[PDB]
Design a protein around this ligand. Structure first.
Ligand SMILES: CCNCCOc1ccc(Cl)c(C)c1
Length: 330
């Protein structure tokens, strides 16, 4: 089997991407944030505290003839950005782009933190990291991809995120018309439950490539590119007037600037992030100070190849017995 679904930016800055997902019988379609950095499929629901729902579409398990309460199961997750959610668990039929899993754990939120409430466009998350990170207790549950894998034509999914435009998540096949050149594959460590890999270096604009190992995670659920402070300083030093602002929370730059590109290595291959992808717009409405798309990972504990990096590539998440990642230009 295969599936194919369009993923759409939630706003004009590409702050996140939503993909429609069918849950239950008859189908209830929710727009979920596919997150290769976590492993829970959780949704706003009829059980979510009412004051914490503000415009999201909810899953109502009592209206699904295939929903079954997973007796005794609870979940609670805290994300690296400080947001969180928790609740109870159903199993139900879940379909993405024509690919169907029966018996998928659907984690129904009783509580969500304020950042989720305040984002009316995200109805929940669909985790695509390794199932070892799933938070359901006392019986850990499998991700949608893990449940589908054995049925897929090939045990893979691909992320093709657009810049200020829709893109595609495919399951079970590699669309050879979606990228240019060849796909370069690179090794993955699953030891921390992430799609963790080692980039071979970077360049800033037309500068010379610096060969250096950068261990990080391919994370579709993180907006920006988080890299070591040395690399990030070298980038922003090429932008007149850019500076790290402790009060704003990262590097800011004059909105009048033309940003240089940023290149990252995948083996001997090179992915080029155009400068425009690194502009996240005014820090507050009407300001002439703009927020940078490349930020330091120093306070995080891991480097993160988030959407800013991944949208510049066609990315293969290869879930074969030994997982790997593939990157192609597009
Ligand atoms: C920490 C990086 N990714 C995991 C959390 O992802 C999101 C996505 C959407 C929203 Cl609204 C929030 C608050 C978090």
């Amino acid at each position: 089997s295969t599936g194919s679904a369009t993923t759409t930016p939630i706003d004009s800055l590409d702050d996140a991407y939503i993909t429609p997902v069918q849950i239950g019988t008859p189908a209830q379609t929710l727009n979920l944030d596919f997150d290769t950095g976590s492993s829970d499929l959780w949704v706003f629901s009829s059980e979510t505290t009412a004051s914490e729902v503000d415009g999201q579409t909810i899953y109502t398990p009592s209206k699904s003839t295939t929903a079954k309460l997973l007796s005794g199961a609870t979940w609670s997750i805290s994300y690296g950005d400080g947001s969180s959610s928790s609740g109870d668990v159903y199993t139900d039929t879940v379909s993405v782009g024509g690919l169907t899993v029966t018996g998928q754990a659907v984690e129904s939120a009783k509580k969500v933190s304020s950042s989720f409430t305040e984002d009316s466009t995200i109805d929940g998350l669909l985790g695509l990291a390794f199932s070892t990170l799933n938070t359901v207790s006392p019986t850990q549950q499998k991700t949608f991809f893990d449940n589908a894998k054995a049925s897929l034509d090939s045990p893979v999914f691909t992320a093709d995120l657009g810049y200020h435009a829709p893109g595609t998540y495919n399951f079970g096949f590699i669309d050879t018309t979606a990228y240019t050149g060849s796909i370069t594959y690179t090794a993955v460590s699953t030891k921390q439950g992430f799609w963790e890999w080692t980039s071979t270096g970077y360049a800033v604009g037309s500068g010379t490539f610096k060969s250096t190992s950068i261990d990080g995670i391919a994370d579709t659920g993180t907006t920006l590119l988080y890299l070591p402070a040395t690399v990030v300083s070298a980038y922003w030093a090429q932008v007149s007037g850019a500076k790290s602002s402790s009060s704003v929370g990262g590097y800011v730059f004059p909105c009048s600037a033309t940003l240089p590109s940023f290149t990252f290595g995948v083996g001997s291959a090179r992915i080029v992030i155009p400068g425009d992808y690194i502009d996240f717009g005014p820090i507050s409405t009407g300001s002439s100070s703009c927020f940078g798309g490349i930020q330091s990972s120093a306070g995080i504990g891991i480097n993160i190849f988030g959407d800013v990096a991944l949208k510049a590539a066609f990315v293969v998440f290869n879930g074969a017995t030994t997982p790997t990642l593939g990157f192609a230009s597009k």
